[PDB]
Amino acid sequence: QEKKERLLREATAIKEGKKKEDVSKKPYTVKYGLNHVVGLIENKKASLVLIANDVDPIELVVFLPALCRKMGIPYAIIKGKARLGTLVHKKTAAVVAITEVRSEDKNELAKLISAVKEGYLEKVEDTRKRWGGGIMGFKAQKREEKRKKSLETA
Amino acid sequence: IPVDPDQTLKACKALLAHIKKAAAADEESTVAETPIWLTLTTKKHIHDSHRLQPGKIILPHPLNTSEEISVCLITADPQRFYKNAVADEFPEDLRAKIGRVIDISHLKAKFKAYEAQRKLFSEHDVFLADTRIINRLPKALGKTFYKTTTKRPIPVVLMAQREKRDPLENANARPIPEIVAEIRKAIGAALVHLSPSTNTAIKVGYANWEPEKLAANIETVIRELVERFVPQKWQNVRNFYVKGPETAALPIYQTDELWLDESKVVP
Amino acid sequence: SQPGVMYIARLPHGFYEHELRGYFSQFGEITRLRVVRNKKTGASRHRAFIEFADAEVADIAARTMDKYLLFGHILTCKIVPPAQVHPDLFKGANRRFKVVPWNKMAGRQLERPLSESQWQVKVAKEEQRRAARAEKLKEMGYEFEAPALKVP
Amino acid sequence: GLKADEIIAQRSALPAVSVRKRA
Amino acid sequence: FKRAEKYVKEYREQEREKIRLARIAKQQGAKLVFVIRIKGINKIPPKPRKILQLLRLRQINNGVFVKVTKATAEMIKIVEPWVAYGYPNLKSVRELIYKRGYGKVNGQRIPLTDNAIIEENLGKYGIICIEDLIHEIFTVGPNFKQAANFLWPFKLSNPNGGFRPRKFKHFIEGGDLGNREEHINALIRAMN
Amino acid sequence: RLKPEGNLLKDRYRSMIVRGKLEARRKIPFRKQAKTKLTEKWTFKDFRI
Amino acid sequence: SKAAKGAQAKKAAQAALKGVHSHKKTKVRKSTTFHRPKTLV
Amino acid sequence: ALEKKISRALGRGDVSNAARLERNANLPEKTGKPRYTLNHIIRERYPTFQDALRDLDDCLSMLFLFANLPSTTAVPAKMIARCERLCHEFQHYLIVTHSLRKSFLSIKGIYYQANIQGEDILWLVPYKFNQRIVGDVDFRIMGTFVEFYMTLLGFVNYRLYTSIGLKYPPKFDQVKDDQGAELAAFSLEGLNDPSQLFANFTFFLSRETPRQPLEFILRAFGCKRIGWDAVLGEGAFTTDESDPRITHQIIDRP
RNA sequence: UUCAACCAUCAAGCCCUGGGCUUGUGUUGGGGACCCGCGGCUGCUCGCGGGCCCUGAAAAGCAGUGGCGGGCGUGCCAGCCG
């Protein structure tokens, strides 16, 4: 509806003999779509990158933390591709990014970027290199505890 | 007035000569941009609380007449009407002097940060503010603008003189020549600031002017400041001094009684 | 056993003694608490020290609330070592820090009537103050005939 | 400039990678 | 568990309310109004909560009739953040008294199903029927205080409760501070 | 001073039941809730600090 | 107990970092047979 | 399905989409009409206008009872105001055609008997007091009866007004309604003997008198000039009690 | 278990016809040189208020003064005054 209203206003300006740039301002939106966000990261335009934690297949985003680290972009893994889709008016978004914001939100963006830097990346700087999984089952853990206790007693 | 003008003009010559001989130890640039401060000492606090809206005193020789001075004007919503008014129906000297016009809503949006307030403080020399919104400017500008009284927003009247007003539909503004007269009057007027203190310092001129101009300026600001902004008139007044930013204080008036009234005398 | 002291800074305006006590009482019971405030005006200096009776509970609170983004502030929560704990750290803790109108007091003594003896004392000290300013303004090239203070 | 602008525009030293020359 | 942001928000709300109350008290400075208790901030300062106790507005969606004097205007200005008030008209007064009108008899809530209760409790003052009560309330007579004390506070409904996706939403949102004048009648129609 | 008697809502309801447009039923103030078991979520179980 | 205060602090940390909706209702089943739910036809 | 879509929009935060889908829900709280249209049901249930007139007894009793009740989730306030509107329109038709025949002040209410097209219609109206809703009735199925009888009475009123050649619906003045006109808020305009007992009299109803039944009976039995106290509402012929044109006054005070 | 917005986007009072005056009190914290005014301090100095710069909404004891009421003389007041 907003795009339709903007197109009607731009058509009115064209009919009255004015460019669409005279009636429409420069937009500022979040950036979405995996190819688009990867291109922005490679061109070093994205200020902040948020990657959904549950993309299946995982190969679509498995390189994205390494790409962001090489490009020097602040990135963060967040819960919910549906939660990102609610932002981008879709059912699901795999990754979102901010390239630039308005002047009244530049401070908020910088504070969020710094908060991400000392609150996510510094905490996961070591844990991102470790192998996951390896958790044993409940019954197997109980059997192992009983065996270790028996070995310690005997 | 108890003060004598020959002493004042002699003091301006002495202080100016001190300023050049101290600067001699660019020379002209060091001499210029040097404010001249009139210091009032009283017996009690001049006002009960801090007043963040400065008072204006009209001067025969206006201040800030140099073309390098940038003026930031803060108006009520919207800023578009006043920006168009400045761009179209203002004289060229005022158009060159006014470097930024921003309304209260955009000020609260873009300048809530302390670093943003310091940047806006550094980007201008004189801030003018519409009286409809000058009460909300202490919160919108913080202690950056009000810790120091030098660049406090000077009250100007832009309201047309006689529900929620729609800014886009109506501006409720007085005519443009009246706005221009108000802006030039506020730019040329000297500023007084009331604090719970016995000392008030008011910029009256620069070193590069002439001692006759400083004497006339200091005489009129003394008489107006005492008759308007000093409670209990002259028997509250203790001392008057003239000083530079780094020079000593040259007295131009002492009193003979150090008490407000005879009721303070207790035997 | 050993009490634990945490240092919390980057405090937003409003996150003060009562809010700190109420928030961290959920983590554990607090022995002492003090927000560093300026005696000039009574305003906070955006930092505080909290002593819990349990260092392990303090460690949990510090790791939980370190780098917490609150009202545009990224909070700084650390545990100070017991060797680095100052013995006079919690002086004035667990009591309110009052605001005192020093300027209003000074105005009141300026408006207080006094007795004639210190009236001659004050006009006398004004006399050598004006005299000292006179040999200061001898190098000025300036001269003023000073009216003598008549004594009450 | 502003510290917020520096933090937003802060990147790494490795140069940008482009698929093609754009307009 | 309580959040630190909730703690800071509560401190800032109470600081703002303290500033507003001190400003009103320092500044200082007859019609009929209908006052409906709405949702405001969680913690209420002692003077506004005492005024609400006097006005019998402890429960949300309670409505009372107030005669505008200097004192009552001051108390209304005090408790503006927790009430919505305006000028009721004759249809609103008539519908409120006939449909949701209850009487205070010995401290119990007795509905006005007849003229006998009004004649027994207000007959010494000349009010012998429901329409006499309506006349006294609307014209603000000498016995307005006793008529309003006889009338129990009106329990208004929540129309949002008739629709499941917005069932938990309160009907009157905070933010429209100040007098609503004749626009309180739409609220009375929707909630009566 | 007339004292109205009876309830017209109950009168119309009884008229409907007697004429047979609906049957006489009683009010159910509480319905039997579905029997459930409360368990902690896996993320809250595996939270470690 | 020390375990009790540690559990209280850990619960406070869990509430601060993850929220308060820690529990989910689960239907009880008196039979081991799952039936296809009856839907609108 | 539409309610599920509205819940989805509210859960995703699309407030504009939620409002746009909600305006298709046609809620009784916003329209004053039943949620589901019963126009095809009315013709099926009443093949003839005679059958409609014969069920009008229960219809009028139901709607005149629910015209005086507080708002609930089953029957909202706009719906109650619509019921009042339909009752007032039917009363205006009876006043204009002089079809009201008998009235009775019983201990439970006021019985009215009218004669429309050869059918005698007797219905009961409560006295204007706080009606008590008890838990011994199924109020929600009573509300469904209210929806059905409202849909029936709308068509009955349209047919009667068109039969006597009047514009339906009549013009309604919201300002006079807010000032309390009740029956006097309606202005009946043309499309495109016990009728004259009170024709020569001027009546004044006091404050304690029941204005709605007194006005309805007098105006249906020929009175053209009725005044009353200002708190009884707008639309009076006169307001001052000292008006010398008044011939009769109704009082009930000792 | 909501970190939103919400002061006056002008009112009231004077002059009595000029468009001017008064009130409506609302400021993040630190750091560095350095010119001052006023109160104590024998004095140094310390307070109160100005002048010139620096800074992500930055921070690592140094807390200092007298009383009304309230709580149990008081390192207690989400209550005030000085």
PDB file of N, CA and C in Angstrom, chain G residues 19-35:
ATOM      1  N   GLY G  19      14.696 -15.197  29.865  1.00  0.00           N
ATOM      2  CA  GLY G  19      13.302 -14.903  30.105  1.00  0.00           C
ATOM      3  C   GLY G  19      12.688 -15.810  31.152  1.00  0.00           C
ATOM      4  N   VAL G  20      11.368 -15.696  31.284  1.00  0.00           N
ATOM      5  CA  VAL G  20      10.637 -16.393  32.336  1.00  0.00           C
ATOM      6  C   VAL G  20       9.739 -17.500  31.813  1.00  0.00           C
ATOM      7  N   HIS G  21       9.591 -17.643  30.496  1.00  0.00           N
ATOM      8  CA  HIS G  21       8.745 -18.693  29.931  1.00  0.00           C
ATOM      9  C   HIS G  21       9.580 -19.960  29.774  1.00  0.00           C
ATOM     10  N   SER G  22       9.875 -20.584  30.911  1.00  0.00           N
ATOM     11  CA  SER G  22      10.735 -21.757  30.952  1.00  0.00           C
ATOM     12  C   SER G  22       9.981 -23.070  30.796  1.00  0.00           C
ATOM     13  N   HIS G  23       8.664 -23.074  30.971  1.00  0.00           N
ATOM     14  CA  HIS G  23       7.900 -24.309  31.041  1.00  0.00           C
ATOM     15  C   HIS G  23       6.846 -24.362  29.946  1.00  0.00           C
ATOM     16  N   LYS G  24       6.615 -25.570  29.438  1.00  0.00           N
ATOM     17  CA  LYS G  24       5.636 -25.829  28.395  1.00  0.00           C
ATOM     18  C   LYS G  24       4.715 -26.957  28.831  1.00  0.00           C
ATOM     19  N   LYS G  25       3.416 -26.761  28.624  1.00  0.00           N
ATOM     20  CA  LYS G  25       2.429 -27.783  28.942  1.00  0.00           C
ATOM     21  C   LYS G  25       2.523 -28.938  27.956  1.00  0.00           C
ATOM     22  N   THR G  26       2.390 -30.154  28.478  1.00  0.00           N
ATOM     23  CA  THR G  26       2.404 -31.366  27.674  1.00  0.00           C
ATOM     24  C   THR G  26       1.162 -32.179  27.997  1.00  0.00           C
ATOM     25  N   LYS G  27       0.455 -32.610  26.955  1.00  0.00           N
ATOM     26  CA  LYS G  27      -0.748 -33.410  27.135  1.00  0.00           C
ATOM     27  C   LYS G  27      -0.408 -34.764  27.744  1.00  0.00           C
ATOM     28  N   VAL G  28      -1.244 -35.216  28.673  1.00  0.00           N
ATOM     29  CA  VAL G  28      -1.085 -36.552  29.230  1.00  0.00           C
ATOM     30  C   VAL G  28      -1.867 -37.534  28.367  1.00  0.00           C
ATOM     31  N   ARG G  29      -1.321 -38.733  28.200  1.00  0.00           N
ATOM     32  CA  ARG G  29      -1.894 -39.739  27.314  1.00  0.00           C
ATOM     33  C   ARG G  29      -2.044 -41.040  28.089  1.00  0.00           C
ATOM     34  N   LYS G  30      -3.289 -41.437  28.333  1.00  0.00           N
ATOM     35  CA  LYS G  30      -3.587 -42.668  29.046  1.00  0.00           C
ATOM     36  C   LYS G  30      -3.455 -43.903  28.168  1.00  0.00           C
ATOM     37  N   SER G  31      -3.284 -43.728  26.862  1.00  0.00           N
ATOM     38  CA  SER G  31      -3.088 -44.827  25.934  1.00  0.00           C
ATOM     39  C   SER G  31      -1.819 -44.593  25.130  1.00  0.00           C
ATOM     40  N   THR G  32      -1.233 -45.685  24.648  1.00  0.00           N
ATOM     41  CA  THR G  32      -0.047 -45.633  23.808  1.00  0.00           C
ATOM     42  C   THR G  32      -0.388 -45.609  22.324  1.00  0.00           C
ATOM     43  N   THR G  33      -1.664 -45.458  21.983  1.00  0.00           N
ATOM     44  CA  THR G  33      -2.124 -45.448  20.602  1.00  0.00           C
ATOM     45  C   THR G  33      -2.370 -44.014  20.160  1.00  0.00           C
ATOM     46  N   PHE G  34      -1.734 -43.619  19.062  1.00  0.00           N
ATOM     47  CA  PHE G  34      -1.962 -42.323  18.445  1.00  0.00           C
ATOM     48  C   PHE G  34      -2.981 -42.492  17.328  1.00  0.00           C
ATOM     49  N   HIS G  35      -3.990 -41.631  17.315  1.00  0.00           N
ATOM     50  CA  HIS G  35      -5.013 -41.638  16.282  1.00  0.00           C
ATOM     51  C   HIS G  35      -4.873 -40.388  15.428  1.00  0.00           C
TER      52      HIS G  35
END
